[PDB]
């Protein structure tokens, strides 16, 4: 016998890292940070912009305090209605 396991990680997976894709036309760190602030305390927010168009590029990076602190949103962020425009959320491992 001696057969029984569940599975547990060791190293701090990048899970925490939270990223948003397909954002609204005019989206500033303020709006997002505010929309997410509801979930909990945020660490920092950095939205990518374009060089030509004076509007958000379409992708942003949201960092939280801890992993679990992010999951809260990572689950309540995917395909969420924001300012009429729906945004998506992801979180790979290799970047």
Swiss-Prot record:
**GO BP terms:** cellular response to glucose stimulus; cerebral cortex regionalization; embryonic brain development; mRNA splicing, via spliceosome; positive regulation of mRNA splicing, via spliceosome; regulation of alternative mRNA splicing, via spliceosome; regulation of RNA splicing; RNA splicing, via transesterification reactions
Reproduce the UniProt comment on modification after translation.
Phosphorylated in the RS domains.
The tissues in which it is expressed are: Highest expression in heart, skeletal muscle and pancreas. Less abundant in kidney, placenta and brain. Lowest expression in kidney and liver.
Q: Does this entry carry the keyword Cytoplasm?
A: no
Keyword set includes Phosphoprotein: yes
The Swiss-Prot or TrEMBL record annotates one GO molecular function as: identical protein binding
Limits of the RRM domain = 16-89
Enumerate the UniProt keywords alphabetically.
Acetylation, Activator, Isopeptide bond, Methylation, mRNA processing, mRNA splicing, Nucleus, Phosphoprotein, Repressor, RNA-binding, Ubl conjugation
Q: List the disulfide bonds.
A: none
Please provide, in alphabetical order, the Gene Ontology terms of the cellular component aspect for this entry. nuclear inner membrane; nucleoplasm; nucleus; protein-containing complex; spliceosomal complex
Q: What is its main location?
A: nucleus
What the protein does comes down to: Sequence-specific RNA-binding protein which participates in the control of pre-mRNA splicing. Can either activate or suppress exon inclusion. Acts additively with RBMX to promote exon 7 inclusion of the survival motor neuron SMN2. Activates the splicing of MAPT/Tau exon 10. Alters pre-mRNA splicing patterns by antagonizing the effects of splicing regulators, like RBMX. Binds to the AG-rich SE2 domain in the SMN exon 7 RNA. Binds to pre-mRNA.
This one is known as Transformer-2 protein homolog beta
Whichever gene encodes this chain, its name is TRA2B
First and last residue shown, out of the full length, are 110 to 191 of 288
